[PDB]
Structure formats: structure tokens, C-alpha cells
């Protein structure tokens, strides 16, 4: 069916930014602890908290 409202339509230049979800998704149930405070480490590359 036709939409009741007409749609603005045309080419537009779009850029892919370097923020991927796969480089940012992070989870940790348990992992390595820091040597000093024995708390979870920092950073998703180190399976951090």
C-alpha cells in the first residue's frame, strides 16, 4: 500500500565511523584480578570488569 505521507528520498554521502559494536561488546562473569587490590582488572582486551 502507498504510504499516506510522501518520503524525502535521494542519495546522501554517509561515512562509516570506526566504532564497531564488535570492538565494544563486553561481558565478564569472572576473570583475572589485579595484583594489588585483588579487584577485577580494567579493559575488555584483558577480560576486565
Amino acid at each position: 500500500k502507498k504510504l499516506m505521507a510522501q518520503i524525502f528520498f535521494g542519495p546522501t554521502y554517509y561515512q562509516r565511523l570506526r566504532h564497531m559494536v564488535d570492538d565494544k561488546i563486553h561481558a565478564r562473569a569472572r576473570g583475572p584480578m589485579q595484583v594489588l587490590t585483588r579487584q577485577p582488572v580494567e579493559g575488555r582486551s584483558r577480560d576486565g570488569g
Binding site: 562473569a29 569472572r30 576473570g31 583475572p32 584480578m33 589485579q34 595484583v35 594489588l36 585483588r38 582488572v41 584483558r46 577480560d47
Partner: protein, 310 residues
């Protein structure tokens, strides 16, 4: 002897020694690979300063310096208090000698591995009863030469004498004593196979540097390396010094490749007598076939008639 104080990660259910143990670093666990039972959890994966207890020993010292709000009067008194300490005089002089090692290696543009090898060689040969009367410069020079030889990067005696003003006799005796005590420490500690690192000749390692001093192309350098390798088979010049063997091989391949460099320029650059170079070329002219690389003359880049006769 002494208390045990040792923890072994053994599975109390599989009872298999040695156990198959997986260190799940991502999940922070130490588990048995057979049953999956965890053994130690919350394992440890910056805040201080790096200090290797092999180069400077177990020395832990901090210096006094200017802060954000610092008076000049308080800093000088603390510096004089730190300087006037009697128990670290041996540590102070060995750090001064290590600073001299770094100064001499940095004035030669030697790589960092040479500095480390010379430092550990000085530390191993330090405070020896057999090595007490020798001059400090001789110890310095022999440590630098040992560090160059150990890293397969060995310089010559003339190089070290060009930097460090040391007489030839005392430098040779110091090198012999330090080699003896280094072999003794290797036998007492971790045994090291030489595999041609303390080699007296080492004429393969002088060819690229000596060709670089003359600005030769690469193929001249590899032809000279092949010539110097094949010069060992010649019994007439096997007793020659490896500097002279390297120089006459380089000069033979310069004449072979028609490089416009005279014997006088080679002798001036590498401090070999021009008569010695000429005699070495004359005595190597009879063995032209063996010294010249056969694949070079097969490819036609060089020919044996380019070498002038005697």
C-alpha cells in the same frame, strides 16, 4: 633443607600426578582437564620500576630530585648525605664503570646488546683475585671486545684501541684472563656452547663493515666474503691475521669487479700496509680459480682476466 612452602595444584578427585591442569586466564580459574574441578580461583593476571637482579644485583636505591615546591638548601644536604655512604662503595664504583661502558658503547654507536653483554661480562669478571693489577682501561676494552664477540658482531683489536687508549700487551693479557674466568663462571654456572663465538679469526664478520668503509656495492662484499671463506683452504695464508685476509680478499674482488679504488686508498682506510696488501694479492694470484665465486664468472658479471698479473 629449609621449609618447603610449596603449593602443588593437584586434583583431589582424579588423583593423577602430574595432573592435566588448564589455567583459564579469561575466567580466572585453574581447573583440572579431566573432571573440570577448579583448584584455585581469583588468580592474578605498572606500579613500580623494572629492575633485573642480574646486571646490577639486588640493589634498590632512589635518588633525590627537585619537586614542584622544593628549596635548594634541603636538596644539597640530602645529596651529600646520600653520597657519604661507605657500604655501597663497591656498588658506586661498579655503577661508575657501567656508566663508562655505556659512554664508550654510545661513542661507538654499538647496539644495545653489546652494552648489555659488556656490562654482564664486567660484572662477572669483577672483584677477581687473578684480575686486580690490570688497568681499568684494559678491563674496559676487554669487556667491550667480549661483548662484541658474544653478539656475533665482533670488532677488531684496532677498533677498541682506536677508542680506548690501551697498550696491546696489557689488553691481550686482560682479554685472556677475562676469557679464562668467563669460561670458569660458565662451567660453575650455566654451561654455554661456544659454537664459534670466541673465534680468533671471525673474518666473515669484518667483510661487510670493511666494504662499507670503502663504499663498495653488495656483490663485491659477498664475493669478498666467499673469497675470505675459501682463503682458509689456502695453507700459505692461513696464518695471516684475519684483518689482512679480509683486506686482501676485498682488494682482489675490487680488482675483479673493476672498482676504481687504489691499494693506497684501501690501505689508508683500513690501516693495513700497502706492501702487505700487495704481497697478499701476489700470493693469492696463483689461486684465482678457487677464490673467485664460480657462479659469478658463470653469470658473466666478472672475468678472471680483469685481475692484473704480477
Amino acid at each position: 633443607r629449609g621449609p618447603n612452602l610449596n603449593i602443588v595444584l593437584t586434583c583431589p578427585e582424579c588423583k593423577v600426578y602430574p595432573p592435566k591442569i588448564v589455567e583459564r586466564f579469561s575466567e580466572g580459574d585453574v581447573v583440572c582437564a579431566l573432571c573440570g574441578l577448579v583448584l584455585s580461583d581469583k588468580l592474578v593476571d605498572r606500579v613500580g620500576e623494572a629492575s633485573n637482579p642480574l646486571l646490577d644485583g639486588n640493589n634498590l636505591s632512589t635518588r633525590i630530585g627537585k619537586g614542584e615546591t622544593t628549596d635548594m638548601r634541603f636538596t644539597k644536604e640530602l645529596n651529600k648525605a646520600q653520597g657519604k655512604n661507605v657500604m655501597d662503595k663497591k656498588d658506586n664504583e661498579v655503577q661508575a664503570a657501567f656508566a663508562k661502558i655505556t659512554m664508550l658503547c654510545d661513542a661507538a654507536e654499538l647496539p644495545k646488546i653489546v652494552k648489555d653483554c659488556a656490562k654482564e661480562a664486567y660484572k662477572l669478571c669483577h672483584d677477581e683475585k687473578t684480575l686486580k693489577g690490570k688497568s681499568m682501561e684494559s678491563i674496559m676494552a676487554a669487556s667491550i671486545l667480549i661483548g662484541c664477540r658474544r653478539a656475533e658482531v665482533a670488532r677488531t683489536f684496532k677498533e677498541i684501541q682506536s677508542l680506548i687508549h690501551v697498550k696491546t700487551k696489557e689488553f691481550g693479557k686482560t682479554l685472556n684472563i677475562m676469557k679464562n674466568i668467563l669460561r670458569g663462571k660458565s662451567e660453575d654456572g650455566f654451561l654455554k656452547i661456544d659454537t664459534d663465538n670466541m673465534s680468533g679469526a671471525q673474518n666473515l664478520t669484518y667483510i661487510p663493515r670493511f666494504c662499507s668503509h670503502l663504499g663498495l656495492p653488495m656483490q663485491v662484499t659477498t664475493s669478498a666474503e666467499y673469497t675470505a671463506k675459501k682463503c682458509k683452504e689456502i695453507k700459505e695464508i692461513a696464518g695471516k691475521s684475519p684483518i689482512t685476509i679480509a683486506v686482501v680478499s676485498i682488494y682482489l674482488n675490487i680488482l675483479l669487479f673493476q672498482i676504481p679504488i687504489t691499494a693506497a686508498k684501501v690501505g689508508q682506510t683500513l690501516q693495513v700496509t700497502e706492501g702487505t696488501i700487495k704481497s697478499g694479492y701476489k700470493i693469492l694470484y696463483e689461486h684465482r680459480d678457487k677464490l673467485v665465486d664460480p657462479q659469478l664468472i658463470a653469470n658473466g658479471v666478472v672475468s678472471l682476466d680483469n685481475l692484473p698479473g704480477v
